[PDB]
Amino acid sequence: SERIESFVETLKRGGGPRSSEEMARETLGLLRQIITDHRWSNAGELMELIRREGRRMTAAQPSETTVGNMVRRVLKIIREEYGRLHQLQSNIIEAINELLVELEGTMENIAAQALEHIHSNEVIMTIGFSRTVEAFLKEAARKRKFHVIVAECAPFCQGHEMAVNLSKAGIETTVMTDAAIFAVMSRVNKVIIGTKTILANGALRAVTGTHTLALAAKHHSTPLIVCAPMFKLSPQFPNEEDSFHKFVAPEEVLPFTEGDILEKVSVHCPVFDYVPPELITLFISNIGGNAPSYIYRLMSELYHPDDH
């Protein structure tokens, strides 16, 4: 039925399911359902329906790149499925089920490869809460006691919660304000950041302090990993400008109090930022450990030239 419309409203109003493959489980859900029982013609009328419902879905807040990402991957499974087909619903829904089960284990396998990086007594450093970086760092509690420096930035700040969820289970964290990321980072090694979405050229679109942070990395020459799973490799190299973000209400940065000053003064609030591929020095991923400058072909491994 048209419960997807509710879903089309659900992404419209906001209220995030915290990126935990819930957008992916949902997009797989609705694509499974529209894939299940709909109109049927042989010659990709299903694919045309995927383009229509696709572009209607992408008409949401243009930041949830996972929605269109798994949409396009469903299309590539359709194209290869027909490619071998040269009863298709059985093969398509089965392979989509296999992609679901493969998606069902990202946060474990991307966290197994952790002992091979962090060593004893090694002052790691991140910024901003992320599920994968916390799970990833929790499987390195069967090794020695390092430190963790976490930045408290990007207000409204969703960051501390992580400083709790770590320090009551693990290593000796300290929490620094965002405006002190250059007295620190003279005494550190091995920076990690989680990623909101990563671009085709090799860019990280992340939380609103990622840049200003990576610049310090390629100033003191410390390597920064951006641990990010699959299904977040977005096409469309950074052409569209200023729709790249989320501008939120300036209540979060200035209070509605202090009247009259708020007549003539301009307030800005960006949620994301731009990390170019000239500063990332490894990707830890779900299947391999690929470098920055290789990421290109990995994208060609997944998609098809209908990247629009």
């Binding site: 207000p155 320090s167 300290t174 304000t177 007295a183 940065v253 003539k264 307030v267």
Partner: protein
């Protein structure tokens, strides 16, 4: 007396030399009330600092010069003393008392040493009123000379670059970078200032509501995401309070997180400081000379009040809130001093003269 002490919490490893303090008033409980011979007057200001009621990196010099002007205008010159070594010894533990208020200060030392000079330079045979009124008179001529009648003069150089079309960017509160950027709207030359402010004790609002009553327009961004003003800036007049002879620029903790985040976009960076606030030390990094301050202020009441109060009851989760930073003079352009627009590397050349 001078119990002082009362340090709290666990400092975050690394620097254990720096002494943390809590704003529970500390010292007020110990002191005697009839007069309490520690301080006739300086207990007033000394109480006034700790709560956060002066705190501007300038005008602490004005405060200490005022109170020392009164206490120097109260002295008694005992029957067996020369009053030079007597008073010059007498002022010691009182300045030590304010020194236990908050870590020392920033170059008010230079004032203190100057006072010690003028006290030591006193003639050995005069009237108590003669040398007394002479002393406080000179103590006035100083603050008229290097604090009053120089900041006006260090604005006339600044107009020469601030001309029409540019988009300047000051950072947080400032003492001179309001005068020499607000005596430039008067005398025309329209522009568009953008201010950027740091997450605790915000301090950027004092600018943004001390400038809209001049009429020059504005904008506002927190230091966490100052990567959007930088593709439209045309200067940054980031002024600060201590110049160290290795060309270091001791700013607030935010600065230097912007400067070497600016020169990767090719916009210049111009510092503005005064002529007494440059000191003869040398420091290489931030972790030898900071001053931590009350790590309880970090509490974002943003819904369920995620533990902020609860950290103490957690173990190994200490938060740190630094106060200064450092700017190395490879990322700093011209310094607009009160003796010309001298180059950064000649930071020592003003010293000998």
């Amino acid at each position: 007396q001078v119990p002082t002490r009362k340090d709290y919490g666990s400092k975050v490893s690394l620097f254990s030399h720096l002494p943390q303090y809590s704003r529970q008033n500390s010292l007020t409980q110990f002191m005697s009330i009839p007069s309490s011979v520690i301080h006739p007057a300086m207990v007033r200001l000394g109480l006034q600092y700790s709560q956060g009621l002066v705190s501007g990196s300038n005008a602490r010099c004005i405060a200490l010069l005022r109170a020392l002007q009164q206490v120097i205008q109260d002295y008694t010159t005992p029957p067996n003393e020369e009053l030079s070594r007597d008073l010059v010894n007498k002022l010691k533990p009182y300045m030590s008392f304010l020194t236990q208020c908050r870590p020392l200060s920033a170059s008010m030392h230079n004032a203190i040493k100057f006072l010690n000079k003028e006290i030591t330079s006193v003639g050995s045979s005069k009237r108590e009123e003669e040398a007394k009124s002479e002393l406080r008179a000179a103590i006035d001529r100083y603050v008229q000379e290097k604090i009053v009648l120089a900041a006006q003069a260090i604005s006339r150089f600044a107009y020469q670059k601030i001309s029409n079309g540019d988009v300047i960017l000051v950072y947080g509160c400032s003492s001179l970078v309001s005068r020499i950027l607000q005596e430039a709207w008067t005398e025309g030359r329209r522009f568009r200032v953008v201010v950027v402010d740091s997450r605790p004790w915000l301090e950027g609002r004092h600018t943004l509501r001390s400038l809209v009553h001049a009429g020059v327009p504005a904008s506002y961004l927190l230091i966490p995401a100052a990567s959007y003003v930088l593709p439209e800036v045309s200067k940054v007049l980031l002024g600060a309070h201590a110049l160290l002879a290795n060309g270091s620029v001791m700013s607030r903790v935010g600065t230097a997180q912007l400067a070497l985040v600016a020169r990767a976009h090719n916009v210049p960076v111009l510092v503005c400081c005064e002529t007494y606030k440059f000191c003869e030390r040398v420091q290489t990094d931030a972790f030898v000379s900071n001053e931590l301050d009350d790590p309880d202020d970090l509490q974002c009441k943003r819904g369920e009040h995620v533990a902020l109060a609860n950290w103490q009851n957690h173990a190994s989760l200490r938060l740190l809130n630094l106060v200064y930073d450092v700017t190395p003079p490879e990322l700093v352009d011209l310094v607009i001093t009160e003796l010309g627009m001298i180059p950064c590397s000649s930071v020592p050349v003003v010293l000998r003269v």
